[PDB]
Design an enzyme around this catalytic site. Structure first.
Site: not given
Ligand SMILES: C1=C(c2c[nH]c3ccccc23)CCN(c2ncnc3[nH]ncc23)C1
Ligand SMILES: [Zn+2]
Length: 278
Positions: A122, A124, A127
């Site tokens: 992930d 995103k 993050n």
């Protein structure tokens, strides 16, 4: 011997359902006065294991780890540079050199993870953290940073799924190719101002991600569009990076033609944003 009393709490950096993160100052030993990040987990095992195995300039460092009472304590390097997200939020859209810089560092961190059988899943932008110099640090290896939890067992769908590969959403089995998808979704967000596949609600977003009909904005350079086309593909195996070359395949793309990888890795390339100056 390290224990929680060795650290005074300075402020809450984040708090989720499963853990909580503080900025802390060590008050004992030869690192007296040193500032760290302290993550406290209510017992999380794969997280500690990953951090103890990884070691790379673009992955956050684990300094101490201990358990006392029911809590697990990870003492990480403190990252004062904030989330990548914050930079994207202030800029609206990144210039391509800007985007290029961050994706290049990220792709090196991902190379390292894959060589050790680790999948980030992930990318995103909240993050991805920045250190005090403005260089990338991958930081998110824990369970779930959310308050409210999707389903009641697994934690895939809890936060945004807008950067997650189709095969993850389908739970049909996956591998490192998912990380190169997520790099493309991040790259797309950087360059266009939003992730590639968004819906009016959850159901629609999943449906758009599964259909995977990429819209490449005409504004972007030729090399950017070609890289995005090669990353955001439904067929995982045919993604740039999915093959034997892993990060190598991605790093050799014309989009990164101006990157000295040796200099980048040694963090001798100037970051486009310097948090200390902001
Ligand atoms: C934001 C985090 C966070 C936000 N909400 C959460 C809920 C549960 C668990 C963690 C979080 C985690 C990481 N983080 C860091 N900030 C500064 N230095 C850091 N070093 N290592 C990590 C780190 C800031
Ligand atoms: Zn969750």
């Amino acid at each position: 011997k390290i224990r929680p009393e060795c650290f005074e709490l300075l402020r809450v950096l984040g708090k989720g359902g499963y853990g909580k993160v503080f900025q802390v100052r060590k008050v004992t030993g030869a690192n007296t006065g040193k500032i760290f990040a302290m993550k406290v987990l209510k017992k999380t095992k794969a997280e500690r294991n990953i951090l103890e195995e990884v070691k790379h300039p673009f992955i956050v460092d684990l300094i101490y780890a201990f358990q006392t009472g029911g809590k697990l304590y990870l003492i990480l390097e403190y990252l004062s540079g904030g989330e990548l997200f914050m930079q994207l939020e202030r800029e609206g859209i990144f210039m391509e050199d800007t985007a290029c810089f961050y994706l290049a560092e990220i792709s090196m961190a991902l190379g390292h993870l894959h060589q050790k059988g680790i999948i980030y899943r992930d990318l995103k932008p909240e993050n991805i953290m920045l250190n005090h110099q403005g260089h990338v640090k991958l930081t998110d290896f824990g369970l779930c940073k959310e308050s409210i939890h999707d389903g009641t067992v697994t934690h895939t769908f809890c936060g945004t799924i807008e950067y997650m590969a189709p095969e993850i959403l389908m739970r049909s089995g996956h591998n490192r190719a998912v990380d190169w998808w997520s790099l493309g979704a991040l790259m797309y967000d950087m360059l266009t101002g939003a992730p590639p596949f968004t819906g009016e609600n959850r159901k629609k977003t999943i449906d758009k991600i599964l259909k995977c009909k990429l819209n490449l904005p005409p504004y972007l350079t030729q090399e950017a569009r070609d890289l995005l086309k090669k990353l955001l593909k439904r067929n995982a195996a045919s993604r740039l990076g999915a093959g034997p070359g892993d990060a190598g395949e991605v790093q050799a793309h014309p989009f990164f033609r101006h990157i000295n990888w040796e200099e980048l890795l040694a963090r001798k390339v100037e970051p486009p944003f310097k948090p200390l100056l902001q």
